[PDB]
Design an enzyme around this catalytic site. Structure first.
Site, short mmCIF file in Angstrom:
data_model
loop_
_atom_site.label_atom_id
_atom_site.label_comp_id
_atom_site.label_asym_id
_atom_site.label_seq_id
_atom_site.Cartn_x
_atom_site.Cartn_y
_atom_site.Cartn_z
N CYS A 92 34.11 50.85 56.14
CA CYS A 92 33.68 52.14 55.56
C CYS A 92 33.98 53.17 56.60
CB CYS A 92 32.16 52.17 55.32
SG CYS A 92 31.40 53.90 55.07
N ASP A 111 31.78 46.55 53.99
CA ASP A 111 31.53 46.79 52.61
C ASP A 111 32.00 45.58 51.86
OD1 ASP A 111 30.44 49.25 52.80
OD2 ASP A 111 32.45 50.27 52.80
N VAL A 164 52.78 38.65 40.58
CA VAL A 164 52.35 38.57 41.98
C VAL A 164 51.98 37.12 42.29
CG1 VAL A 164 49.97 39.31 41.49
CG2 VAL A 164 50.88 39.52 43.80
N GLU A 165 52.49 36.59 43.39
CA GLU A 165 52.18 35.21 43.80
C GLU A 165 50.70 35.16 44.19
OE1 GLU A 165 52.76 32.76 47.31
OE2 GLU A 165 51.59 31.73 45.75
N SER A 166 49.90 34.42 43.45
CA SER A 166 48.46 34.48 43.64
C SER A 166 47.93 34.18 45.10
CB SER A 166 47.78 33.72 42.49
OG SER A 166 46.86 32.75 42.92
N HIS A 182 36.03 53.36 48.94
CA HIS A 182 36.23 52.37 47.88
C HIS A 182 37.20 52.83 46.76
CE1 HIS A 182 33.06 51.01 50.31
NE2 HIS A 182 32.04 51.09 49.47
N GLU A 183 37.04 54.07 46.31
CA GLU A 183 37.97 54.76 45.39
C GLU A 183 39.38 54.70 45.93
OE1 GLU A 183 35.12 55.82 46.81
OE2 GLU A 183 34.15 57.38 45.60
N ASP A 241 20.11 46.18 39.02
CA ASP A 241 18.81 46.42 39.73
C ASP A 241 18.93 46.06 41.25
OD1 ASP A 241 17.33 43.14 38.71
OD2 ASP A 241 19.13 43.67 39.88
N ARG A 291 19.85 43.28 42.78
CA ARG A 291 19.35 41.95 43.09
C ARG A 291 20.26 40.85 42.48
NH1 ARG A 291 15.02 40.79 46.52
NH2 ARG A 291 14.76 38.95 45.07
C1 LIG Z 1 31.56 54.37 53.23
N1 LIG Z 1 32.39 53.60 52.78
C2 LIG Z 1 31.24 55.53 52.37
C3 LIG Z 1 30.36 56.47 52.88
N2 LIG Z 1 30.23 57.43 51.91
C4 LIG Z 1 31.00 57.11 50.83
N3 LIG Z 1 31.10 57.86 49.69
C5 LIG Z 1 31.92 57.42 48.69
N4 LIG Z 1 32.01 58.15 47.55
N5 LIG Z 1 32.63 56.24 48.82
C6 LIG Z 1 32.53 55.47 49.96
O1 LIG Z 1 33.27 54.31 49.99
C7 LIG Z 1 31.68 55.89 51.05
MG LIG Z 2 20.57 42.17 39.13
MG LIG Z 3 22.01 39.66 40.22
#
Ligand SMILES: *C(=N)c1c[nH]c2nc(N)[nH]c(=O)c12
Ligand SMILES: [Mg+2]
Ligand SMILES: [Mg+2]
Ligand SMILES: *C(=N)c1c[nH]c2nc(N)[nH]c(=O)c12
Ligand SMILES: *C(=N)c1c[nH]c2nc(N)[nH]c(=O)c12
Ligand SMILES: *C(=N)c1c[nH]c2nc(N)[nH]c(=O)c12
Ligand SMILES: *C(=N)c1c[nH]c2nc(N)[nH]c(=O)c12
Ligand SMILES: *C(=N)c1c[nH]c2nc(N)[nH]c(=O)c12
Ligand SMILES: *C(=N)c1c[nH]c2nc(N)[nH]c(=O)c12
Ligand SMILES: *C(=N)c1c[nH]c2nc(N)[nH]c(=O)c12
Ligand SMILES: [Mg+2]
Ligand SMILES: [Mg+2]
Ligand SMILES: [Mg+2]
Ligand SMILES: [Mg+2]
Ligand SMILES: [Mg+2]
Ligand SMILES: [Mg+2]
Lengths: 139, 145, 145, 145, 145, 145, 145, 139, 145, 145
Positions: I36, I43, I58-60, I77-78, I143, I145
């Site tokens: 991150c 992450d 794509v070769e797995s 992440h986006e 939730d 969990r």
């Molecule tokens: C860390 N990976 C991080 C911290 N803040 C984030 N905000 C968004 N939108 N996406 C992330 O992967 C983020």
């Molecule tokens: Mg759950």
């Molecule tokens: Mg669960």
């Protein structure tokens, strides 16, 4: 006591007593298996068969022997579906039909062959084309 | 003592107090059973009936007694659905009705007949046709378990 | 070239990577099928196999083939689950093994055989015995669909 | 063609080819129906029947007909589970059997009788007492839908 | 007509035709409702009642009538599960019985009372203690949806 | 105290602070109960009510009070979903609203009435028709458990 | 206006009308929240409290108000569970109590503290100890989703 | 800003304010990963850590950095669990502890290492032995 | 020898077995993890990748490695889901592809990015466009969990 | 250390490195809580927020603080969903956004407001109208547990 080599002669029909209305009948078939044409290794599927009849309906138990007759026979997945569909047409000559095979995946490939047919020139021919188009959007 | 031979006459109806609008009423009928006409073997299904009423509504208790009357009555699944629908069109004269039958497998194979009906020449006829054209685009998964 | 008559000879083993340890190894076969001895009609199941190895592990490919070899064998389901367990025991000398079988229905009824084994005298035999006393305390919901 | 008045005699057994091992066999029976004794009205259930054999297995096609044989016989649910258990003990003299019946609701209430038996004076009797005393420590959520 | 204030008298029983065995019968009762005694605001629960009969069984419809009799009756949930238990003990003189009620939440918190009983002096008494000692060792996930 | 016979007056509303947008609000209402008009026997349902506000919103607690007011009120389920819909239309003058009730079964068959509405003349009117034409194209599996 | 700083004094109790037997009452508390003492960061949990009462019962509304008072109160999760239990032992003087807290993850890691208590020198002390020795032999699967 | 080579010095404790009673605390840890000792290929697990404290409790955030410090380090699965458990003992010296690692399976082998420890001579030593015995019966 | 810095060069392709056809191929990666960018903290996600090939697949194996190469890469992440999609597009010239990402929570919030593509001008672009308009109409319950 | 009085200003954005592609990002937010405006009493929800970016992404840590900033602010649920949507439109000026809030029940009723927006005069406005008009054709089963 069971044809396991290919046997369309087994299929059977009974009259449709309600020719006035368009209605749908679907067979769910999770026990389908046959031979793969190159390797020779069994393949497995659920087959969903849906038709709007015209004048003739396929008899369930005869569709089951028909489906078994594939157990020991080899051809591809796509053809296999066209074979089933074409025999069913030959048998029933229905307003509409579709055959969707869902094979157990092999490499991540959900090899899920889908064919349909509407009666040529009719409003079913357009329903085929429309349902076919739909099929890919979320298969 | 109940009657288990076919009995359309049982069906009863009452006035729709809300004719001015279109609404849907659904019956879930998980307890449906009849006989295969060739075999004598019993067959089982869940039947869904949905209908937009006009002036008359089917009374549940009578629908119960009506569906019981199939209990020792042979017919093919596709016929039953059509017959159940017809008795209901005859009793009710609905704007729109559908009957969807999901039967338990025989010989590995289960049969899901679906029939509908819109009042002729109306927007409901076109409705019957749209829900037929579009029926079951995404068939649910069936493994027989 | 695949054998579709019953063929134990196709099963193969390899050295267990951790003899030191007790780990379950799990195989899951959604496409077993065999013949039913009375009528000739095909039968279908998912077979779940779990075992704790001693020195040998079943080569997972060869187990697939072994299971396909049932495609023209005719036997009952209870017997099948026992033949498969036995053949696996003979091949592998396992500490513990169980085979659970879930058939698709015939006549409305499905048959789930469950069989186990643990090495005689060991705590694995205690384990198999306890698993049998406690097996399937809560059967899963089944409506043939 | 079929008996729907109660008929124990339709039950058939075949020998256990694996007498010297304890194993479990389960029958899932989602298509059961009988009549209520006072009212005359149809009852419905899924019946789960698991048993350990000794020398005789119950043949499934015959269990099918035996279960059909209840379609027009009236008894209370609790009775029916005990009758089924008893005719199966009669037929097969097994190490252990349980019959668990789960019925569709009436008047909002549904009834799920569970009965077992282990061959008396043996470890199976203790398994019965155990499985009974630990029965349903966590009952499944039911909302009548 | 239907009594909506509390009513033990309605309860009815019938002989157990199978007294020479221990078996469980369960009632699922997802339609129970009652009043809160300070506020007067309705509460709702699914109640499970399982019991091992001795000579008398509870008659199902009488039970539905008995549970209706709490609809306009004020009491706390803990007391209701006990009262229900006592009226059925009083009617039935069962070998074992338990009543488990799962109420819908209020101010964010739901109450699940669980009470049982076994015939004093007998092995059933010990049953009750075991089931009480071991009750709800793994409580289910509740999120109030 | 709590009115248990029918009561539109209780309903209350408050301005929409966000009238310049279309948004949905849903009420899940799993605690509704009412009377059957011939028999007098209680019925139960989960009701979903979703609506697109125009200038007024329904106040949540007033809604709970309004639904309590059916506890000792006799009516058929189809009428109740409409009445509920009408009182909220009358109170709210919403752009769109629907009321979907799922009742618990009787004699084996449950009734799920679905009614909606959109402001006559507007795009919401067409909404109602679309949602009505497309209602419940894939009905959920019901087995009455 | 509610108090969101720690408030054991809110808790109220009423007499157990059924002291003569052992029963369990469970509270499901999905809506529990407090502060991390070092961070100030809020933390969330579902708390299960189960207790066999002696002469006194906790009143739900007060338990609600009591758990709210954690809302702006810092403490470690393990402390909270112990503190909640102590306030409850102090109010109620129970035969047996357990408090099981399931918190939502922080930094990938979630904390499930579980505490119990049996009345000293009694069969409940031994109970507290058996349910401690045996606590969570089969931990549920946690993926943080 | 994160030690990803092995770092027991990171672990941290705070006093237990309730030494009179035996109670259980469980950490659920689904984000555990480390290096496999031969191949070098990452492995992944959920780690369930349960302890009855005596006088000291492990601090959550320090257990998280501790767990991260494995991300770039290689040793076996069994040892890995004993390493975690032993550090936790060294840290807390608790009445009872257990560490159960559930690794994503690789060949059908649910390699699920389980260790525990009760305080030597005490009633915890017997609870260890009893819980260990239980573990296999239904893992 | 595995690269833990970002490494596209490790991706490999092979000839599509059926160019004739449209089949989805699905990859499911339960063990992706990356850094991150702001804080350095790791992450975690499950990545679901589906595509319809044209000439190349794509070769797995190499995809597994490619995904492990993120273990020390720092990005949002986006952005990640887009880098993975792009790299796959560049490698394979697919007809259609989508990548869906399900992260574990941080601060109580989890982030599920979803990105797609279809060949520009083709009906695959129509397909990607429709899938975006319809994506995740019913978000799954979460939730933490 | 943290703001719990409502604070829009804590919201932060960062540039979209993939402006030229439509993609979806979803935030699952199971830890939300605010106060009821009249009563003062705590409300709870899971909030799902999915949006298509244009040039600015919302930074998640900042969305976290922004959501916390509601812990002591009172508003009605419907308002809160619109306020959250509006402050996010302000911050990022996105192609499309939806906020769907699912609240824990009060008085038996729970409230699930759903709001969306597409940038006006574009295809995204049509996606909003579409996603709105097709909103919740199948509402999830809710039993308050
Ligand atoms: C860390 N990976 C991080 C911290 N803040 C984030 N905000 C968004 N939108 N996406 C992330 O992967 C983020
Ligand atoms: Mg759950
Ligand atoms: Mg669960
Ligand atoms: C018995 N019910 C039966 C036997 N064969 C059938 N074929 C079809 N199509 N439908 C049935 O209901 C059948
Ligand atoms: C066919 N396979 C068949 C026929 N009858 C059977 N009965 C039992 N118990 N098991 C089977 O596999 C059976
Ligand atoms: C009808 N089948 C019926 C009516 N009343 C009953 N009571 C009990 N206990 N069991 C039944 O099966 C009943
Ligand atoms: C109302 N039914 C009510 C209100 N407060 C209660 N507290 C407890 N413990 N039990 C109840 O049934 C309660
Ligand atoms: C009782 N509520 C009842 C009895 N019969 C009914 N039939 C219909 N259609 N609707 C009801 O609400 C009914
Ligand atoms: C904050 N609530 C917090 C921070 N670190 C913690 N460690 C432990 N063991 N428990 C907590 O509740 C913690
Ligand atoms: C409290 N949060 C509350 C009380 N009454 C409400 N009514 C509506 N519609 N929404 C709320 O959030 C309400
Ligand atoms: Mg199924
Ligand atoms: Mg099923
Ligand atoms: Mg249900
Ligand atoms: Mg829930
Ligand atoms: Mg159900
Ligand atoms: Mg629920």
């Amino acid at each position: 006591n069971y044809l396991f080599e290919y046997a369309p002669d087994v299929l059977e029909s009974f009259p449709n007593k309600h020719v006035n209305r368009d209605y749908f009948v679907k067979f769910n078939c999770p026990e389908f298996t046959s031979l793969c044409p190159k390797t020779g290794q069994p393949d497995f599927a659920t087959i969903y068969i849906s038709y709007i009849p015209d004048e003739k309906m396929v008899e369930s138990k005869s569709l089951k022997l028909y489906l078994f007759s594939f157990r020991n026979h080899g051809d591809f997945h796509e053809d296999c579906m066209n074979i089933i569909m074409n025999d069913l047409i030959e048998l029933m000559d229905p307003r509409y039909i579709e055959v969707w095979g869902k094979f157990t995946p092999r490499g991540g490939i959900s090899i899920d062959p889908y064919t349909n047919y509407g009666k040529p020139g009719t409003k079913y021919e357009k329903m085929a084309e429309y349902r076919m188009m739909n099929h890919d959007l979320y298969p």
